[PDB]
Write a protein that binds this ligand. Structure first.
Ligand SMILES: *S(=O)(=O)N1CCOCC1
Ligand code: SF4
Ligand code: SF4
Ligand code: FCO
Ligand code: F3S
Ligand SMILES: [Mg+2]
Ligand code: NI
Ligand SMILES: [S]
Lengths: 545, 263
């Protein structure tokens, strides 16, 4: 039962970090098998904020959507909220509903793919699945999840046979040099659990197609939706009966998979890795909220989000503070930007690239370092979960307590890599639990009202902010309009908060802090680093833009 | 038995990963079938198990394979400051792509970024991003769009592996998918011909499904198959009431903007 840990003392660099979006280099210093220092070094700059200068504010959302195609949609949404605020238009109720449903669909797609296709390979030894007894696996699956044909011995055996043929082919493809090949002490699961998870990994590749089709009924296409406009949305067809019936049907299929496969697999894995409830914790959490009933202003978004906004500091769940948008700023001291850029509120943001050299610990990332009232903030599912749980949000109370009871852990165990992973599933289940209600709301509204875009006029000079809680956390886009054109456009993105470098005072970002204390069983195959990094669900294209 | 599926090396340069995402939306075949039965996907950062030096070792193993390999490139090549603003494993993206391109059996650029330069090349182009052919002077099979339909990318891959190089237009795009204007297949075409346009998004004309040309639609100047095949088996932008941006055209970020006007 002790967590495996070598005596290794020395540096470890992992570049590329695979099974994330974008280009990340992690450096750590290790002593006696535990990480003692860490650096999160983002390795690509594109410069979308620069590109936007002088352009038509209506065009922003089309450019900024291309910050990232994994969290597709969310930047189009934040830019649309931002320009709607800058032009002082309140979007119609139907547009709020449609925009928020597309966000919900995104959460379902994104979190399912993350757990199975990005994160699972850190916990699941796929090759060990070939050793499982498929009948024992079927019996176990029947004890831990709803009855389903894909969990039958016949179905699990068919998976095993496909995998066996692939491994024996001599071309391991995406499994080439996997850390679990040949056995790895940090991989704990029984073969039968590996087989169940692997079967679901393959099913999830098909289910994510359906999740994206649902999203596209309202969004136009996925990736990169095309249904938002200044003042609301363009998709009148998405208010109508047959499309919404198809959207519900697909969403119910996806949610059945969440409830039958994702949550039971997540809890099974969590049960074997309970030690990871004591690894990878941070202390401060931020959310702008999402799923608001009033999106007529940023303040109303913060106040009326059904996944609430807030700030937690020092792990204190007894108090959630209101978000003060004026208190957000970004540092560049440890980033690849010109000196003189520290302490900038995003309305005053500056994006002046200045590269030094690889592994310069004075300047080691293309991400800025966002800070709040001087503190680093973790954003994302765990932040949302703690904020909602602390406030007594009834769906989060119910589903969190379900998980705490199943694992026999307190809420404090969620301040961890296991907790971060768990929270992602908790909120996916909650989104699923709300889809029928949200869809009915929109269907009934669209049947009685086809207002979808409000009238508006471009101001000569203005400013605005668009807030969203994207799958990875608190997203904000900030515009200064002058001469009816973009004078400044700043993105501050969730992976910027989580995976940026140190701030002006030398203070580690959330991922850097979380990596301190990571045990390393085998320094040549440092899966433990991946477990924590992947738990934050990094997106470097998002983070740097 | 000695077995071999054709090796594919997939590189990610200055990209948003939306092209990888589009590719996994394939249903003919689904992505699992493609990678288990049709190709050997030997390097792919977004989904591969190995990380770090183990991933770099997997790349080198693929590049040195005696059977050769096909190269898929996602993203533009950031060239400023010696290529250093885009690096993997401590190497400039332009260097790795140049090396992989030199020995590839064929090169498929997935997306407008790898084909033509894409979003990061848009003015003022901070990183001096270039398309693959632009940077390297090599001919590529371009599957553009932002992102392309999986039908077009997977169709091209399967064509290359079974038939040969498909007939390409002057922008390097397979005519099979890119031979027709979006507009020529748009269901709003009868409105266009009758000069029946939506003047604004809130207008009754928009509600009625009138043509979106006055709102900036670039369908008339954009080669793609969007209305014919749809996305996600359910929709495409104009069916969702929004104009085409021109996203399969080279340099569209600069040639098709402002998006809501006819510039
Ligand atoms: S537009 O320029 O009027 N237009 C109409 C027909 O074809 C291309 C462009
Ligand atoms: S072509 Fe578009 S979707 Fe593909 S990598 Fe480039 S920005 Fe992303
Ligand atoms: S909506 Fe666009 S593609 Fe369709 S007919 Fe009008 S201009 Fe052509
Ligand atoms: N979710 C997401 Fe992408 C990141 N980080 C954004 O915004
Ligand atoms: S924006 Fe692109 S996806 Fe098709 S509809 Fe126009 S070419
Ligand atoms: Mg920024
Ligand atoms: Ni992203
Ligand atoms: S190969």
């Amino acid at each position: 039962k002790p967590t495996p840990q070598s005596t290794f003392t020395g540096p470890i660099v992992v570049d590329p970090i695979t099974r994330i979006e974008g280009h990340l280099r992690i450096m750590v210093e290790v002593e006696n098998g535990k990480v003692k220092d860490a650096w999160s070094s983002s390795q690509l700059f594109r410069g979308l904020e620069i590109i936007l200068k002088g352009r038509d504010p209506r065009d922003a959302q089309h450019f900024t959507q291309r910050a990232c195609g994994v969290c597709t949609y969310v930047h189009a949404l934040a830019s649309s909220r931002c320009v709607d605020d800058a032009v002082k238009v309140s979007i119609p109720a139907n547009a709020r509903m449609m925009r928020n449903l597309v966000m919900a669909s995104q959460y379902l797609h994104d979190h399912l793919v993350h757990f199975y296709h990005a994160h699972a390979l850190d916990w699941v030894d796929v090759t060990a699945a070939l050793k499982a007894d498929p009948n024992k696996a079927a019996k176990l699956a029947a004890s831990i999840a709803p009855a389903r044909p894909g969990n039958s011995a016949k179905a699990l055996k068919a998976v095993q046979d496909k995998l066996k043929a692939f491994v024996e082919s001599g071309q391991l493809g995406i499994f080439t040099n996997a850390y679990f090949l040949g056995g790895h002490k940090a991989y704990y699961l029984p073969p039968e659990v590996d087989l169940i998870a692997t079967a679901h990994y393959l099913e999830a590749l098909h289910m994510q197609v359906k999740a994206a089709s649902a999203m596209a009924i309202l969004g136009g296409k996925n990736p990169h939706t095309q249904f938002t406009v200044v003042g609301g949305c363009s998709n009148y067809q998405g208010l109508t009966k047959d499309p919404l019936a198809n959207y519900l049907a697909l969403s119910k299929e996806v949610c059945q998979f969440v409830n039958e496969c994702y949550i039971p697999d997540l809890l099974a894995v969590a049960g074997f890795y309970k030690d990871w409830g004591g690894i990878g914790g941070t202390s401060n959490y931020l959310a702008f909220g999402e799923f608001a009933t009033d999106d007529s202003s940023p303040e109303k978004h913060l106040a009326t989000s059904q996944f609430p906004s807030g700030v937690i500091t020092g792990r204190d769940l007894g108090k959630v503070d209101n978000v003060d948008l004026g208190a957000i700023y970004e540092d560049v001291k440890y980033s690849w930007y010109a000196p003189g850029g520290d302490g900038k509120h995003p309305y005053d943001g500056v994006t002046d690239p200045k590269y030094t050299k690889l592994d310069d610990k004075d300047h080691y990332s293309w991400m800025k370092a966002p800070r709040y009232k001087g503190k680093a903030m973790e954003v994302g599912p765990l932040a949302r979960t703690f904020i909602a749980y602390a406030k007594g949000q009834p769906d989060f109370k119910k589903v969190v307590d379900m998980v705490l009871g199943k694992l026999s852990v307190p809420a404090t165990a969620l301040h961890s890599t296991l907790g971060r992973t768990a929270a992602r599933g908790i909120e996916t289940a909650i989104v699923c639990a709300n889809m029928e209600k949200w869809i009915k709301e929109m269907a009934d509204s669209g049947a009685k009202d086809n207002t979808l875009c409000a009238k508006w006029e471009m101001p000569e000079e203005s400013k605005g902010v668009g807030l969203a809680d994207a799958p990875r956390g608190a997203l904000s886009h900030w515009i200064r309009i002058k001469g009816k054109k973009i004078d400044n456009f700043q993105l501050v993105v969730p992976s910027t908060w989580n995976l940026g470098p140190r701030g002006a005072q030398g203070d580690k970002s959330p991922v850097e802090e979380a990596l301190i204390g990571t045990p390393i069983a085998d320094p040549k195959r440092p899966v433990e680093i991946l477990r924590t990094v992947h738990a934050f669900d990094p997106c470097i294209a998002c983070g740097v833009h | 038995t000695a077995k071999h599926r054709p090796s594919v090396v997939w590189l990610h340069n200055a990209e948003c990963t939306g092209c990888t995402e589009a590719a996994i939306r394939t249903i003919k075949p689904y992505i699992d079938a493609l990678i288990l039965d049709t190709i050997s996907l030997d390097y792919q950062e977004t989904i591969m198990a190995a990380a770090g030096e183990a991933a770099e070792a997997a790349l080198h193993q693929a590049l040195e394979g005696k059977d050769g390999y096909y190269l898929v490139v996602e993203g533009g090549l950031p060239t400023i400051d010696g290529g250093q603003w885009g690096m993997v494993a401590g190497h400039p993206m332009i260097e790795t792509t140049k090396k992989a391109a030199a020995k590839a059996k064929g090169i498929i650029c997935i997306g407008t970024c790898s084909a033509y330069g894409g979003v990061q090349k848009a003015k003022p182009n901070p990183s001096q991003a270039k398309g693959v052919s632009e940077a390297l002077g090599v001919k590529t099979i371009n599957i553009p769009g932002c992102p392309p339909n999986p039908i077009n990318f997977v169709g091209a891959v399967v064509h290359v592996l079974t038939k040969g190089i498909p007939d390409l237009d002057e922008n390097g795009r397979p005519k099979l998918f890119y031979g027709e204007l979006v507009h020529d297949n748009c269901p709003r075409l009868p409105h266009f011909e009758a000069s029946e346009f939506a003047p604004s998004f809130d207008s009754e004309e928009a509600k009625k499904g009138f043509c979106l040309y006055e709102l900036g639609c670039k369908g008339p100047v954009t080669y793609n198959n969007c209305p014919k095949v749809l996305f996600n088996q359910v929709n495409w932008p104009v069916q969702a009431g929004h104009p085409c941006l021109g996203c399969s055209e080279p340099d569209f970020w600069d040639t098709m903007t402002p998006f809501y006007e006819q510039g």
